[PDB]
Design a protein around this motif. Structure first.
Motif, PDB file in Angstrom:
ATOM      1  N   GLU B  14      13.762   3.536  11.057  1.00  0.00           N
ATOM      2  CA  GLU B  14      13.211   2.192  10.987  1.00  0.00           C
ATOM      3  C   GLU B  14      14.264   1.117  10.742  1.00  0.00           C
ATOM      4  O   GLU B  14      13.955  -0.071  10.887  1.00  0.00           O
ATOM      5  CB  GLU B  14      12.136   2.141   9.896  1.00  0.00           C
ATOM      6  N   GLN B  17      14.759  -1.598  13.234  1.00  0.00           N
ATOM      7  CA  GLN B  17      13.767  -2.662  13.344  1.00  0.00           C
ATOM      8  C   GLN B  17      14.118  -3.899  12.525  1.00  0.00           C
ATOM      9  O   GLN B  17      13.519  -4.958  12.744  1.00  0.00           O
ATOM     10  CB  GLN B  17      12.391  -2.144  12.917  1.00  0.00           C
ATOM     11  N   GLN B  22      13.020  -8.114  16.768  1.00  0.00           N
ATOM     12  CA  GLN B  22      12.604  -6.722  16.809  1.00  0.00           C
ATOM     13  C   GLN B  22      11.094  -6.580  16.630  1.00  0.00           C
ATOM     14  O   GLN B  22      10.399  -7.492  16.172  1.00  0.00           O
ATOM     15  CB  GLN B  22      13.342  -5.908  15.749  1.00  0.00           C
ATOM     16  N   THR B  23      10.594  -5.402  17.005  1.00  0.00           N
ATOM     17  CA  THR B  23       9.180  -5.065  16.921  1.00  0.00           C
ATOM     18  C   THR B  23       9.039  -3.648  16.378  1.00  0.00           C
ATOM     19  O   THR B  23      10.008  -2.888  16.298  1.00  0.00           O
ATOM     20  CB  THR B  23       8.481  -5.180  18.284  1.00  0.00           C
ATOM     21  N   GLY B  24       7.815  -3.300  16.008  1.00  0.00           N
ATOM     22  CA  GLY B  24       7.505  -2.023  15.399  1.00  0.00           C
ATOM     23  C   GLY B  24       6.797  -2.188  14.065  1.00  0.00           C
ATOM     24  O   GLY B  24       6.752  -3.264  13.475  1.00  0.00           O
ATOM     25  N   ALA B  27       8.873  -4.082  11.414  1.00  0.00           N
ATOM     26  CA  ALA B  27       9.111  -5.469  11.801  1.00  0.00           C
ATOM     27  C   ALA B  27       7.809  -6.240  11.986  1.00  0.00           C
ATOM     28  O   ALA B  27       7.735  -7.432  11.663  1.00  0.00           O
ATOM     29  CB  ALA B  27       9.945  -5.517  13.080  1.00  0.00           C
ATOM     30  N   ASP B  28       6.770  -5.583  12.499  1.00  0.00           N
ATOM     31  CA  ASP B  28       5.517  -6.279  12.770  1.00  0.00           C
ATOM     32  C   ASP B  28       4.643  -6.424  11.528  1.00  0.00           C
ATOM     33  O   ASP B  28       4.053  -7.488  11.308  1.00  0.00           O
ATOM     34  CB  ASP B  28       4.735  -5.551  13.864  1.00  0.00           C
ATOM     35  N   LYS B  32       9.311  -9.179   8.633  1.00  0.00           N
ATOM     36  CA  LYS B  32       9.668  -9.849   9.877  1.00  0.00           C
ATOM     37  C   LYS B  32      10.779 -10.866   9.646  1.00  0.00           C
ATOM     38  O   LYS B  32      10.655 -11.741   8.784  1.00  0.00           O
ATOM     39  CB  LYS B  32       8.445 -10.546  10.478  1.00  0.00           C
TER      40      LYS B  32
END
Lengths: 49, 49
Positions: B14, B17, B22-24, B27-28, B32
């Motif tokens: 991870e 991220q 970034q996303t995931g 991160a989401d 963030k």
């Protein structure tokens, strides 16, 4: 903007902005030169009047 | 002008991220970073602790 996430989209959008802005600068530059030609014909037509 | 130190623990998979854009799951839904982030990200393996 539908297909890419923001930080990738900004790279693609800035290419379009660059090229479209370059298209307006090309248009306005050539219209300013054409305007100068029409001005000369207008000054001539006014003098012949 | 100011500095903010944020700390947390995540999986090694991870860490990737924790970057701007970034996303995931982390991160989401956990932490963030802004697209114009101006800081530094520091991470180390803590399997010993």
């Amino acid at each position: 903007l539908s297909r890419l996430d923001k930080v990738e989209a900004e790279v693609q959008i800035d290419r379009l902005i660059t090229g479209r802005l370059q298209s307006l600068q090309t248009y306005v530059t050539q219209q300013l030169i054409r305007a100068a030609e029409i001005r000369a014909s207008a000054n001539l037509a006014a003098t012949k009047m | 002008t100011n500095v903010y130190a944020d700390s947390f623990v995540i999986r090694g998979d991870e860490v990737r991220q924790i970057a701007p854009g970034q996303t995931g799951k982390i991160a989401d839904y956990n932490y963030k970073l802004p697209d114009d982030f101006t800081g530094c990200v520091i991470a180390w393996n803590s399997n010993n602790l």
